[PDB]
A = this chain, B = another copy of it.
């Protein structure tokens, strides 16, 4: 199984500043065809999880344009251009390259 370690466990980061969340995998998340399947999801309190970034760096539809991803291999980073009040909640990395599907423990972002 794929084991994902997220870092930090929580991110008490000042509003309006850049921020980032790391997702470090036990094994490569790059498929032999060059298609990655790492997905960043944001679960706000009281809401069902919704995907934010797909395939490591691609922005999804209908989401804030302040987020983008990055990385390769076993270490990926979500970059937040500016922290906003709406960002409070828990972020998860899903690894879609192999079955069973797995999630990291989640990073809880706070202002």
Contact = CB atoms under 8 A, between A and B. Distances in A.
Nearest to A62: B81
Contact-size category for A? under 10
A65 B62 CA distance: 12
Interface of A: 18, 62, 65, 81
Can you tell how many copies of this chain the complex includes?
Answer: 2
A81 B81 CA distance: 20
A18 B61 CA distance: 12
A45 to B, nearest CB: 22
Contacts of A62: 18, 81
Nearest to A65: B65
A62 B81 CA distance: 7
A18 B65 CA distance: 15
Contacts of A18: 62
